[PDB]
């Protein structure tokens, strides 16, 4: 007459995990708080072992103790009622997942709320999308360690595993680090996007390739370096059609939502005092996607440069293709020093080459381009930055001419490069010893009295310019 | 008997406050937690009308109702600490004015707090620095109209004074809407700063231009549209000579500093869905100006590539200042859009042309193009980003090959641009009628169902990708 495990949240997500759950084996409650997506699961999986509840009470109720209650409900104010509607019903001792895309400054006050309660509570990020969710996700969870051991087996039974045969799953650290690490790789998430948008971009309007040519260009990329789930899906979406027989890429409409994890991100950086250039204009790409109306308003009044020859069309194809692979390490090396930073700071001693091997299978930014991070930091944990490990550094050796390239051609013929264009600024400001930054110091003391330190000797100091 | 004004925290910019109203006439009464930081203001100033008090209640007695009280202190605790010190004598009406360096959302809550008790409040941004303070400052107030009408005749006389006569401030609006202007200034401040260093690392590792021609040219530039104090004081560094005499901006350490106002404009855009890529770029190279430690670290294994010629020296030398100036056109288009997201947010109804009037003087970014800003709005009070008015998008079909030309030199060269590039990206991608942001909504459809609108049918689709 009791389940195993309970799920609270039939969105997407949450249907396919619960879903994900009962296909090892358990028995498993569901609920959601609009009772008529609870009745369309069942519909839709008859021979599931899913039981429906209509009510908070039931639904608890129906749960072997400790329970384990996982919640996939929307993040904020949504996710904070559904655990406050849970609370009365509960005994100490039960287990409470937060599985949802929880900012982890929540995560870190009901960790503490919860915990003092007396429940075992576990703020986990959850990635896969509807496909993963269903067959197997990269599970991040943080909290107390204890907690997570309650929970690591039913976590590794459903996780996603590696070629290795590693679980997509381990301990990220304490209170918000696994919402943190969930955070940071939907970041990783839209810079990945942005870049492959360039491509694209780049592509079709410098060499004027059918849908057909890009599905091909990407196939071939996804037969070697750049190998990640992403590009796979990218190539599929090239020759889907409609029943019309439209490309579908073609009439969907280009504004492009968000639900907040990337602009938590590039908060963060901001707050960490992080130059997360790539991952922020990625944000700041889809905000600007997002005003429609004012760019078909402007595409009517203001000028832009005419065409220009890109040349050989294979010499061109490889030199987009080498630039989104530099703009990929820079995006990547740019959200581990954030990691690093954020762990630092909220004292989490993250493991970073943990991390990316979470993130080899399960996860959206799924691709072998992860092991080659975590054999960087398996070589040397305490890397400050992904650049400078060998395999990443003699990449940038290789490839950054044709960046330089793409972006020079880009700006020349005004397709817009955000991403690969903050790739080159960012990898020319972290190796340059002396940046520019003298004369700032210098105007900020002249007007506004700040001080500036010396190349030749110990102080602060301020200047009279004036005089 | 009694003043009309007093003035609490003496530190160098409440004094210099103080000492600018009494120099208008004003007697004015002043206090400070620290007895000693008044005394020494008393000892300093011998025939000015400066009247000390060295208890908070003796200082509210001695002004005249309702009161008028200018709390310059610490931002944060320090001023709550001072508001809740001052609260058991005030009587209903009076008015607290909060001229520090405050987070806006602060004075919301300040503003409402006291509101309720019966006190006005009013946040208020003052900008030109210890000089200006005393002599004629940019003054921004947000809160209670009646209130700031009561004490605007003191604050009309202390501002500084366009060159059509009119006085650098005005009402901004309700409750925290002038410390979010002054936040935008210091954000547009990091932006002119940034892109005047961009220019300069061009001259400088392009051009290989001594600091004498740096000076010569930027006094070239400043008499043209380009004419601004930030350009004028930067041509006054470039031939600031040490003890030794060396020039000064050689032997300053280059990690750029900041006290968070930038770090608040892109955490604000971050909220409102703005693209303010420029001022943001502008905050993360102050950021990896910081990590110079990294950054030594990895000019010594990260290569770049081989310098290419400039050409002619005017010729590059026109082309930067182009681009500088059609750089700052983009910064102030993309600041002035998140004053009207921010003004559509938080209900204030902002006047964009009485904003750009007040900046025309006494502020940092003070110059003869917040003219051109102010002129687009007489003409066209609603229009939605400045790019769109005649004069620039003048500028921009005019410069924007120079912008062009800039950003792919520097690019090839190795030195990095991360202003330049943010310009061009946004200008390309405010024209564009359509971005690949089609392929970013296909892709979120794909692994996450996440729906998608389309460009040729009314409605929400969602496709099966996989089947
Ligand atoms: N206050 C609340 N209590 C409980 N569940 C809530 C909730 N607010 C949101 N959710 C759940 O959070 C899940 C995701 O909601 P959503 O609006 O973010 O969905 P989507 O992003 O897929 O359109 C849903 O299961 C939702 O429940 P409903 O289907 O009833 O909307
Ligand atoms: O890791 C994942 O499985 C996805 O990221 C998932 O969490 C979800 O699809 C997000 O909503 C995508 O982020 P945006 O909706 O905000 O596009
Ligand atoms: O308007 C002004 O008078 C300045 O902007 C002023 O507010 C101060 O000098 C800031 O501290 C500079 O900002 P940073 O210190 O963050 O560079």
């Known amino acids: 007459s009791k389940q195993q495990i309970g799920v609270v949240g039939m969105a997407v997500m949450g249907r396919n995990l619960a879903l994900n759950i009962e296909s090892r084996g358990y028995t498993v409650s569901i609920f959601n708080r609009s009772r008529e997506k609870t009745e369309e699961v069942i519909a839709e999986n008859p021979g599931k072992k899913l039981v429906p509840y209509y009510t908070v009470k039931e639904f608890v109720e129906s749960l072997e103790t400790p329970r384990r209650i996982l919640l996939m409900v929307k993040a904020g104010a949504g996710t904070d009622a559904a655990i406050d509607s849970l609370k009365p019903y509960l005994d100490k001792g039960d287990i409470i997942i937060d599985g949802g895309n929880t900012f982890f400054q929540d995560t870190i006050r009901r960790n503490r709320e919860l915990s003092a309660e007396g429940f075992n509570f576990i703020g986990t990020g959850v990635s896969g999308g509807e496909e993963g969710a269903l067959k197997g996700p990269s599970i ?24 290795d045969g590693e679980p997509c799953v381990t301990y990220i650290g304490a209170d918000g680090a696994g919402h943190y690490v969930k955070m940071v790789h939907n970041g990783i998430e839209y810079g990945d996007m942005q870049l492959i948008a360039e491509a694209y971009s780049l592509l079709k309007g410098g060499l004027n390739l059918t849908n057909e040519e890009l599905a091909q260009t990407f196939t071939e990329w ?49 707050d960490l005092g992080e130059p997360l250039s790539l991952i ?33 069309k294979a010499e061109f194809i490889e030199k987009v293709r080498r630039a989104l692979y530099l703009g990929k390490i820079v995006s990547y090396a740019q959200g581990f020093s954030q990691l690093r930073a954020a762990s630092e700071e909220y004292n989490w001693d993250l493991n970073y080459g943990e991390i990316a091997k979470i993130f080899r299978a399960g996860c959206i930014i ?62 020319d400001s972290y190796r ?29 100091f301020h200047t009279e310019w004036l005089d």
């Open 432 to 460: 340059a010893a002396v940046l520019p930054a003298n004369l700032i110091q210098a105007q900020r003391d002249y007007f506004g009295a700040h001080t500036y330190k010396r190349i030749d000797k110990e102080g602060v």
């Open 140 to 163: 991040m969870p943080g909290g107390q360690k204890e907690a997570y051991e309650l929970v690591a087996p039913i976590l590794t039974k459903i996780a996603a595993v590696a070629e």
């Open 280 to 312: 922020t204009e990625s944000v700041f790409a889809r905000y600007i996607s997002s005003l429609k109306d004012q760019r078909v308003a402007a595409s009517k009044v203001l000028s832009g440069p005419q065409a220009q020859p890109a040349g050989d």
């Open 366 to 427: 799924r691709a072998q381009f992860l092991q080659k991070i975590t054999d960087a930091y398996a070589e040397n944990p305490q890397i400050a930055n992904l650049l400078l490990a060998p395999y990443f550094k003699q990449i940038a050796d290789d490839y950054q001419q044709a960046l330089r390239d793409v972006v020079a051609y880009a700006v020349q013929i005004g397709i817009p490069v955000p991403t690969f264009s903050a790739a080159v600024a960012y990898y």
């Open 222 to 270: 996804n037969n070697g370096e750049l190998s990640s789930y992403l590009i796979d899906i990218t190539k599929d979406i090239f020759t889907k059609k409609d029943e019309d027989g439209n490309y579908l890429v073609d009439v969907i409409l280009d504004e492009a939502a968000n639900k907040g994890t990337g602009k938590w991100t590039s908060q963060s950086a901001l």
